[PDB]
Design a protein around this ligand. Structure first.
Ligand SMILES: *[C@@H](C)[C@H]1/C(=C/c2[nH]c(/C=C3N=C(/C=C4\NC(=O)C(CC)=C4C)C(C)=C\3CCC(=O)O)c(CCC(=O)O)c2C)NC(=O)[C@@H]1C
Ligand SMILES: *[C@@H](C)[C@H]1/C(=C/c2[nH]c(/C=C3N=C(/C=C4\NC(=O)C(CC)=C4C)C(C)=C\3CCC(=O)O)c(CCC(=O)O)c2C)NC(=O)[C@@H]1C
Ligand SMILES: *[C@@H](C)[C@H]1/C(=C/c2[nH]c(/C=C3N=C(/C=C4\NC(=O)C(CC)=C4C)C(C)=C\3CCC(=O)O)c(CCC(=O)O)c2C)NC(=O)[C@@H]1C
Ligand SMILES: *[C@H](C)[C@H]1/C(=C/c2[nH]c(/C=C3N=C(/C=C4\NC(=O)C(CC)=C4C)C(C)=C\3CCC(=O)O)c(CCC(=O)O)c2C)NC(=O)[C@@H]1C
Ligand SMILES: *[C@H](C)[C@H]1/C(=C/c2[nH]c(/C=C3N=C(/C=C4\NC(=O)C(CC)=C4C)C(C)=C\3CCC(=O)O)c(CCC(=O)O)c2C)NC(=O)[C@@H]1C
Ligand SMILES: *[C@H](C)[C@H]1/C(=C/c2[nH]c(/C=C3N=C(/C=C4\NC(=O)C(CC)=C4C)C(C)=C\3CCC(=O)O)c(CCC(=O)O)c2C)NC(=O)[C@@H]1C
Ligand SMILES: *[C@H](C)[C@H]1/C(=C/c2[nH]c(/C=C3N=C(/C=C4\NC(=O)C(CC)=C4C)C(C)=C\3CCC(=O)O)c(CCC(=O)O)c2C)NC(=O)[C@@H]1C
Ligand SMILES: *[C@H](C)[C@H]1/C(=C/c2[nH]c(/C=C3N=C(/C=C4\NC(=O)C(CC)=C4C)C(C)=C\3CCC(=O)O)c(CCC(=O)O)c2C)NC(=O)[C@@H]1C
Ligand SMILES: *[C@H](C)[C@H]1/C(=C/c2[nH]c(/C=C3N=C(/C=C4\NC(=O)C(CC)=C4C)C(C)=C\3CCC(=O)O)c(CCC(=O)O)c2C)NC(=O)[C@@H]1C
Lengths: 172, 162, 162, 172, 162, 172
């Protein structure tokens, strides 16, 4: 597992070099935007149960075949397993937001997941729909302009978007 | 790699949890301490060449026998002097990496695992490297909390050699 | 799936054995009890529609707030009433399956695993479903050992909701 | 693991249905022939050691190369292993007779066995000869007309035959 | 296969070590004892046919019932006599193998694993085979440390049958 | 694991035979040269640390890219791992010298090692260079004419050579 700082260090060691000034300045830039990164993780975390629930209700209304007898989310054991999977993806995405790097997400979550769904009979394209719905909910909560000191968080919302998409691409 | 941010994730993930306030406080502490750590890493990087050149001469004055005895483990030949100066630079470079990451991770992975095997196998004395690190500590020219950051990592390496 | 016949095999296989007399007695007990279990499963299946329709109205009369409050968890809209009637039929249908197999296996796998997670996540109260099951027990119109079979499985579900 | 009853239940749940009358009547039919199913399992079980021994002696007389030095049943460790394999197949077959379904046999015995014999150097066609010999012995013992209340057990002997053949097909 | 040389390697490898003096002493002991072991293996091999023929008759005189009762387990038919003579030769041949290797390994792998299962399954008595081994011990015609080597392995087999 | 004696035994059992005189005589020959086999294992073992060290120093002088940043033996953890690998190969080779057969070496060391180096990014041809250097050092130490009763050990040095080469062929 790396973070954005350790990333830069492991690259410089590969060629046996001290850091350039450009690199110190880019890492100083990271540290200065850190408050906003912290607001985003707290907001998304404090509403975790509602993000998952509403995305689930949405998917089953659009794709009602998933819950008909014979469906991949029919019976309470398969429904519970589906709900669990959503909670987990959302967790490893919040980890990667803190770290500022996708390595915790790729290495401990997405790696091998496509093959798992194909072996179980779970439709991967359906999962990717669920991820995309959690994304749009999360960005709205994090970038809500109320009850916070005003400023610009757009570069951060663009980075966040990236992590959700990456999870989506990996299952489909 | 061990940093204050990877430790926080590791505790949430180990117990199956989302991050909580308990963990966010840690990462802010890291972000606040970084102003001093960077001051130190830049200074050490800018003055690296005179620190390495002065550190090697301190070793040669303390243990004069390393510039006269015959053996590939010693600095009695031009190649041996070249290799000693390179090791001292490895040690300095790992201190700057620790400061940039906010913890011991880099020095743990790239240097301290395997250290006592390598020293025994090629007949290299710990005391030589401790002397060099003491010279850098005494002459880095830093003051205040930036000198505090630099010394905590230098002393970390001395303990591993003891 | 747990039945009196799969339990018997499981005990022989666990210990590496051939079946013995100890196990054959169990399976005969099952075969003898089946005359009563089938009587009950057929009766419940034939009268299923009026049992479901009467059970839903019993719930609505006991907790009138579920037909007036706003929320997707309630029966305040036509879609919500449709979904409540479907759940009650799921529960009835699992009772008939238990009776046909001679044990709890089907209700264990298709319904009770995951039950408390689903109820918490979608804001559904256990007390609602208990009321419906009590209505079916009181009005299935069965007598004798066939009523005994039906009640043992209905009470099994009530306990899991308590 | 399923039995004949659980089988019917898991099929009806797949399409979300109550049982039809045809199905109740077929399952009532099963319960009425249950005594004979019980006689057959007891008889075959009570003579297990003799069924295995006589089939072994028969195979080695017909195929004497199996016990020549270098053979797959030469030395007491390989002979013991061969005898063991026969005992096991006979056991999982008796289980499936009780249950009235082949799932315990397929899932916990036959599944992966062909590949095992090919990797060890054991001749699978020889094993299938041994199975067929145990079969003819078992059916004779089960359908012996003496010391029992007379009746017709032919449909049951046909079902029993099926299980032995299935085991045979899987190794060869 | 268990020999004095494979045991020595097994102890070094188990603990991650290079061989030491402790182990080399063992293997020299083996090399020194070999002069007697070979003397015995050659003698037993050269006189094998009369030893097998005399051993079978000793069994038939001690338990006369094995040449008269009906049954495939007995020596009442020409095929049964053929099979008994073959088993006795298996036992003799495993003794010569033990002597050549300097330990019990061959008799462990080719004969003693599975022995009590095979005897029970085909209705064969241990006492029959013990009698045959006693005859070979009494008539191999060996003296001194070569007779000592032969007897230690014959007695090993008798114990496994007891 | 076999030794040279057990080898001959397992072959004779395969065809169900007593040993011929030719075989007793060849095995008597083995036992008579046993002292020299013992001198060779002690000498090579008593100088194990020097054989490994000097071969390592030699390889890194010839192939200095291995220890440049980014190299397969750069950092003290990878260097330590490299040194360890050499110590191990040398150990299983000394075992096979004692036994007089290569089975302990093939079965517990070389088997699967090529595939391991390919998966890690370790250059196998470089390892084989290191093995060959340990070989030439070992044969010189074992066949040193001083401080020992004179005689001829050439057939043994040829057998020893074989084991080192076999290890070399397997990684490259
Ligand atoms: C973009 C996400 C939205 C936004 C963010 C924003 N926040 C600040 C300032 C602060 N954020 C914090 C938050 C924390 N510090 C911690 O240690 C923790 C966890 C323990 C949290 C959650 C703090 C302390 C500040 C400074 C004090 C303050 O309230 O101002 C800013 C200001 C700029 C900066 O980086 O300091 C901004 C812009 N604001 C928006 O309008 C977006 C919708
Ligand atoms: C076909 C296999 C042969 C055959 C069978 C046969 N059996 C019966 C009747 C009975 N079988 C039993 C046996 C058991 N009941 C148990 O609980 C157990 C284990 C604990 C056993 C072994 C019993 C009790 C009966 C009824 C009493 C009786 O002795 O009759 C029948 C009769 C028809 C029926 O299904 O009841 C038959 C036909 N008979 C043959 O001729 C075949 C060779
Ligand atoms: C070839 C490798 C070199 C060589 C060998 C050589 N050695 C001997 C004789 C002996 N070697 C030993 C050694 C041991 N016996 C043990 O039990 C152990 C370990 C516990 C060891 C190391 C002994 C005892 C002898 C006999 C006594 C003696 O010192 O002579 C010979 C002689 C022939 C023989 O096989 O006996 C030879 C030739 N000699 C060389 O010149 C080669 C360089
Ligand atoms: C819900 C949106 C969809 C759905 C999901 C579904 N998933 C499973 C089963 C599994 N999911 C995982 C995934 C993970 N396990 C991990 O540890 C991690 C990382 C930490 C991940 C990402 C695994 C391993 C399984 C198999 C094991 C298990 O189920 O516990 C199921 C179960 C299917 C079944 O029981 O047969 C389901 C239903 N189903 C849908 O229809 C949605 C599209
Ligand atoms: C200098 C204070 C004294 C000294 C130096 C000396 N060192 C070596 C050889 C080695 N140095 C290392 C060290 C490292 N390699 C790494 O990858 C890392 C972490 C990044 C470290 C710290 C190693 C592994 C060696 C052995 C392999 C190599 O040559 O690179 C030598 C040469 C010894 C030899 O036998 O070749 C010398 C001379 N000796 C003195 O006398 C100085 C006082
Ligand atoms: C009826 C007594 C009360 C009630 C009903 C109600 N239920 C839901 C939603 C769900 N019901 C289930 C139940 C099951 N699914 C299964 O697969 C099984 C086992 C076979 C059972 C028992 C589940 C999983 C849900 C959630 C998913 C789905 O919609 O299918 C609703 C809708 C809630 C929503 O938020 O959409 C309602 C209204 N509510 C009342 O007020 C009645 C008194
Ligand atoms: C006898 C008719 C034939 C014969 C058999 C033979 N089999 C083996 C080895 C194995 N048999 C199995 C089979 C199973 N193990 C299980 O757990 C189950 C299901 C519960 C089955 C079906 C396995 C796994 C093995 C390998 C492990 C072991 O042997 O314990 C051998 C041994 C061969 C050897 O030791 O090299 C033999 C001899 N050989 C014949 O010639 C007959 C045709
Ligand atoms: C002789 C003292 C008495 C006796 C002999 C007898 N033995 C058998 C059958 C078998 N013998 C063995 C023994 C071995 N097989 C091996 O691979 C090994 C190790 C190398 C041994 C020791 C076995 C396995 C059998 C059964 C299989 C086979 O026939 O080969 C018989 C035949 C018994 C039968 O039922 O066919 C007999 C007669 N019986 C006497 O009466 C003698 C006094
Ligand atoms: C040194 C000459 C070369 C070199 C070596 C190197 N090897 C590894 C890693 C491994 N080596 C092994 C080998 C074995 N393990 C066993 O148990 C046995 C038999 C008993 C053998 C033969 C294994 C399994 C590994 C992987 C596990 C481990 O490293 O502990 C490394 C490490 C590489 C890394 O850490 O990424 C290295 C460096 N490298 C060179 O450049 C030389 C050519």
């Amino acid at each position: 597992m790396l973070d954005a700082f350790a990333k830069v260090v492991a690259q410089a060691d590969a060629r046996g070099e001290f850091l350039t000034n450009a690199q110190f300045d880019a890492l100083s830039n990271l540290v200065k935007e850190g408050n906003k990164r912290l607001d985003a993780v707290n907001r998304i975390t404090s509403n975790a149960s509602t993000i998952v629930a509403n995305a689930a209700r949405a998917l089953f209304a659009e794709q009602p075949q998933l819950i008909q007898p014979g469906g991949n989310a029919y019976t309470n054991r398969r429904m519970a397993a589906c709900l669990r999977d959503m909670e987990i993806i959302l967790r490893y995405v919040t980890y990667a937001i803190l770290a500022g790097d996708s390595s915790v997400l790729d290495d401990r979550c997405l790696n091998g997941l496509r093959e798992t769904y194909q072996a179980l009979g779970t439709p991967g394209s359906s999962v990717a729909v669920a991820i995309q719905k959690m994304k749009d909910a999360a960005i709205a909560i994090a970038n809500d302009p109320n009850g916070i000191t005003p400023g610009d968080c757009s570069a951060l919302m663009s980075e966040i978007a990236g992590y959700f998409d990456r999870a989506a691409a990996a299952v489909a | 790699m061990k940093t204050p941010i990877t430790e926080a994730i590791a505790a949430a993930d180990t117990q199956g949890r989302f991050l909580s306030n308990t963990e966010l406080q840690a990462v802010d502490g890291r972000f606040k301490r970084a102003v001093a750590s960077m001051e130190a890493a830049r200074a050490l990087t800018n003055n690296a060449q005179s620190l390495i050149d002065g550190a090697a001469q301190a070793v040669y004055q303390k243990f004069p026998y390393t510039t006269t005895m015959q053996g590939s483990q010693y600095a009695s030949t031009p190649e041996g002097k070249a290799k000693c100066a390179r090791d001292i630079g490895y040690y300095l470079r790992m201190v700057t990496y620790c400061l940039v990451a906010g913890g011991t991770g880099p020095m743990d992975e790239y240097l301290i695992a395997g250290l006592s095997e390598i020293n025994s196998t090629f007949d290299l004395s710990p005391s030589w490297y401790i002397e060099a690190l003491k010279y850098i500590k005494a002459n880095h020219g830093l003051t205040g909390q930036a000198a505090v950051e630099a010394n905590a990592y230098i002393d970390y390496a001395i303990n591993a050699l003891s």
